Amino acid sequence: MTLDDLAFDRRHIWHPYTSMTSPLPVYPVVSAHGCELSLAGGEQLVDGMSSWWAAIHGYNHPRLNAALKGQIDQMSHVMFGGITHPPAVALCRQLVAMTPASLECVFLADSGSVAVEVAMKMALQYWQAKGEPRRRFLTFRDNLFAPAPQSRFDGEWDEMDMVPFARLMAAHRHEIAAVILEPIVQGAGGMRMYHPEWLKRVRKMCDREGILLIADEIATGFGRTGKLFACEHAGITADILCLGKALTGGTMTLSAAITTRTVAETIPTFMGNPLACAVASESLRLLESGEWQPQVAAIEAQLQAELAPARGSALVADVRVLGAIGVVETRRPVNMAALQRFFVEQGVWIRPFGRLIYLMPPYIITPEQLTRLTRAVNQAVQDETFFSE
Amino acid sequence: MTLDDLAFDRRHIWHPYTSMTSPLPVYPVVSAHGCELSLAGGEQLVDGMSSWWAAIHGYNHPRLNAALKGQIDQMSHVMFGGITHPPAVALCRQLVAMTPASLECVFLADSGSVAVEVAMKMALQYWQAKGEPRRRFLTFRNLFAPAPQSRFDGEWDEMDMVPFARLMAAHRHEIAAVILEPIVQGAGGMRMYHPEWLKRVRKMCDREGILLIADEIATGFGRTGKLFACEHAGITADILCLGKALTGGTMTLSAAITTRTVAETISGPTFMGNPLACAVASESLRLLESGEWQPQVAAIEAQLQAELAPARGSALVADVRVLGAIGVVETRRPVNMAALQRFFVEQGVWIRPFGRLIYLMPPYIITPEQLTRLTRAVNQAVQDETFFSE
Ligand code: NA
Numbered sequence: 001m002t003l004d005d006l007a008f009d010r011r012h013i014w015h016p017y018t019s020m021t022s023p024l025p026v027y028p029v030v031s032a033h034g035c036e037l038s039l040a041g042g043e044q045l046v047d048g049m050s051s052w053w054a055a056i057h058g059y060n061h062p063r064l065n066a067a068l069k070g071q072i073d074q075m076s077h078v079m080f081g082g083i084t085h086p087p088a089v090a091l092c093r094q095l096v097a098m099t100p101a102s103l104e105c106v107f108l109a110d111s112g113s114v115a116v117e118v119a120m121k122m123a124l125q126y127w128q129a130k131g132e133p134r135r136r137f138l139t140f141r142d143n144l145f146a147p148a149p150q151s152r153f154d155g156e157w158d159e160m161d162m163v164p165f166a167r168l169m170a171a172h173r174h175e176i177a178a179v180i181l182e183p184i185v186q187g188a189g190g191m192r193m194y195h196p197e198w199l200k201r202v203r204k205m206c207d208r209e210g211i212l213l214i215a216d217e218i219a220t221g222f223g224r225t226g227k228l229f230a231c232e233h234a235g236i237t238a239d240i241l242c243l244g245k246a247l248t249g250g251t252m253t254l255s256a257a258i259t260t261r262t263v264a265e266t267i268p269t270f271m272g273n274p275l276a277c278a279v280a281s282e283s284l285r286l287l288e289s290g291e292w293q294p295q296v297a298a299i300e301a302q303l304q305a306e307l308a309p310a311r312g313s314a315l316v317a318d319v320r321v322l323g324a325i326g327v328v329e330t331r332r333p334v335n336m337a338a339l340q341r342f343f344v345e346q347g348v349w350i351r352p353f354g355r356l357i358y359l360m361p362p363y364i365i366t367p368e369q370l371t372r373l374t375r376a377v378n379q380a381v382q383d384e385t386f387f388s389e
Numbered sequence: 390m391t392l393d394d395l396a397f398d399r400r401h402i403w404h405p406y407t408s409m410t411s412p413l414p415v416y417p418v419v420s421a422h423g424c425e426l427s428l429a430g431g432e433q434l435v436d437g438m439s440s441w442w443a444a445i446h447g448y449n450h451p452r453l454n455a456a457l458k459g460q461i462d463q464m465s466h467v468m469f470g471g472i473t474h475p476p477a478v479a480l481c482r483q484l485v486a487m488t489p490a491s492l493e494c495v496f497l498a499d500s501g502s503v504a505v506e507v508a509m510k511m512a513l514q515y516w517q518a519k520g521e522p523r524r525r526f527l528t529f530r531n532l533f534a535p536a537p538q539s540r541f542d543g544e545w546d547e548m549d550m551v552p553f554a555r556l557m558a559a560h561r562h563e564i565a566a567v568i569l570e571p572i573v574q575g576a577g578g579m580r581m582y583h584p585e586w587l588k589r590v591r592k593m594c595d596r597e598g599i600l601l602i603a604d605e606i607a608t609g610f611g612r613t614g615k616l617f618a619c620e621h622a623g624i625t626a627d628i629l630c631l632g633k634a635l636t637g638g639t640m641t642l643s644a645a646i647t648t649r650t651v652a653e654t655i656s657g658p659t660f661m662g663n664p665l666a667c668a669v670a671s672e673s674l675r676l677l678e679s680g681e682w683q684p685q686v687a688a689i690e691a692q693l694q695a696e697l698a699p700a701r702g703s704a705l706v707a708d709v710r711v712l713g714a715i716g717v718v719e720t721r722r723p724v725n726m727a728a729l730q731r732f733f734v735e736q737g738v739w740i741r742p743f744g745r746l747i748y749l750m751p752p753y754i755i756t757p758e759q760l761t762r763l764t765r766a767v768n769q770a771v772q773d774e775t776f777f778s779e
């Protein structure tokens with residue numbers, strides 16, 4: 001990477017959540033290995049982000065690499081219209097086998113958002129097919145927005161938390177096609193965390209009304225909260241389960257909606273992409289050993305222990321840990337340039353956002369690597385200069 | 390592929406535009422090379438579909454393979470938030486250089502539909518920032534203008550634009566953008582519109598300050614005989630959407646490219662900027678830099694025109710329309726999908742019809758003899774009433 005390359009990127013390449021008139025500095029990553037990113041200048045960074053959830057096996061994994069290369073040798077891609085192929089069948093067999101018995105029909109898609117859109121369309125066609133059309137969705141913050149439950153996710157449950165959902169349900173039961181939620185951890189909602197009893201109660205209220213439950217586990221799935229699927233924290237199963245990110249080991253995009261036979265019965269170039277299916281199958285094979293379970297429990301326990309002192313910082317509003325996820329929510333938004341520089345100069349890759357400094361490291365991270373991550377977070381939230389007003 | 394694999398696919402795996410209670414038969418493909426697909430039984434099929442547009446360089450292409458493997462050796466993926474990397478820069482350099490000078494800010498995305506959604510969100514934020522929030526889009530069949538009736542390759546009747554001009558003027562303060570596919574409607578029944586229509590849209594958008602979004606996810610990268618189909622009208626969009634043939638049909642990636650004025654007025658996504666997809670897209674574009682796609686596509690077009698022309702004489706054919714490496718036979722009655730698909734496979738060709746459409750969009754590397762197999766099969770098909778419902 002050259003100085004001109006960085007000028008070109010700055011002037012011509014959009015990055016997430018940044019402007020093009022006043023972009024923030026970006027760091028040139030040229031390669032990656034293990035739990036580390038290699039900068040163009042040669043600096044190594046301990047990754048604390050898993051490239052946002054997905055890179056649970058780390059970077060440059062030999063088995064993911066070999067799966068990709070082996071599929072390339074046969075075919076990178078063929079259309080799925082009127083055609084099926086070994087990678088799609090192998091992947092769907094794994095997805096059906098590893099999910100609860102009732103989840104058995106797989107709709108492959110490119111991206112997480114498309115799999116959620118597909119789930120919602122399934123819910124629309126379900127009710128249309130049943131002679132009872134329903135067009136509204138209920139989600140948590142003409143759609144219906146219920147507030148988040150207040151009870152601390154790892155503490156005691158107050159039944160009063162369900163009143164706004166219950167009253168919305170009582171008022172609109174017959175118009176609601178589906179409830180859509182992320183189980184426990186709100187990867188799309190400020191990394192907030194909800195009590196599992198809330199999820200248990202939503203499932204029961206849906207059961208009572210015949211309403212479909214759509215679980216978005218694109219962020220939570222595949223072991224990240226300490227359960228293979230985060231729905232397990234409440235003991236419930238969704239009618240439609242949406243999956244992605246760690247599905248491919250974070251090598252390339254792929255997603256899936258898995259539903260029941262009752263939904264499926266009552267019911268374009270890259271759909272089923274062989275290359276992505278082959279690497280996702282290898283990513284799932286890595287999970288089959290069960291090693292992710294003591295890995296994530298060890299990460300969870302270290303995160304609890306090394307982030308607990310952040311609760312003592314006047315700038316910290318909350319610390320919340322679940323599985324291989326540690327969130328420090330601050331009282332004031334971060335100074336993005338200054339704080340990101342500090343992290344890189346400390347040899348760690350941690351990408352904060354607004355009032356959030358959070359860790360979601362790859363499952364293969366070492367204790368010492370993780371301590372580097374939590375050390376930097378604790379140092380950050382003790383200094384005002386890393387925070388605007 | 391085993392019988393149990395087929396039974397598992399049928400019972401548990403959705404395919405595009407098919408039911409789950411009564412799926413049509415699907416054919417097991419296990420590998421692909423050149424311009425051919427290899428079925429589990431060893432049969433080779435000549436591909437006429439490019440896996441829907443994108444596989445313009447054919448299958449198992451050595452340069453595309455080496456690009457992918459070379460990137461895997463460095464990294465398959467890293468996030469794009471706070472980070473840039475050599476593959477994203479190399480691809481965006483190519484996309485900026487190969488497009489008109491006004492198109493210079495690249496937003497990379499996962500899939501075709503996301504690039505269009507990003508373009509529309511750009512248009513919304515463009516007007517929101519100018520204190521003039523506009524929320525509606527005008528497309529051709531939201532405001533829907535009648536598709537222009539002038540035959541795409543024939544004479545122009547400017548009366549085609551009167552309904553559009555009426556709608557645009559009546560709603561000029563609600564319209565954030567016109568969205569269209571240039572000439573060929575890959576998402577509109579493979580219909581084809583006159584370039585003068587596209588020229589007039591651009592000029593009307595200019596007078597009103599309305600953004601023009603060109604979806605070239607299907608038409609882009611030489612398919613219509615021009616590098617971008619906008620060239621048939623001599624116009625440039627405010628936002629250009631690209632995908633499919635971007636990666637050589639190896640894996641999904643898309644982009645929305647806009648002007649500096651759009652980008653300035655405006656001013657996590659795990660897989661945005663994916664190094665692996667950018668690396669193979671760069672090599673796909675490198676393959677086009679020789680310009681060899683031009684006479685390849687011109688030869689395909691002339692062979693399509695000649696070998697599809699007799700189908701116009703078939704009582705079952707309403708229209709034949711050919712542009713670049715696209716040949717469309719629109720029938721008067723919809724096809725019997727199972728029986729017609731079996732006939733194509735038995736003939737050794739992969740042609741995937743839909744409703745009243747039997748169409749060809751072969752890889753650019755297809756030989757004359759391979760392509761004649763495709764056109765002969767189509768001509769045989771539309772002379773036989775057995776392949777059509779009522
Ligand atoms: Na299952």
Ligand code: NA
Pocket residue numbers: 484485486487488489490491492493
């Ligand atoms: Na350009």
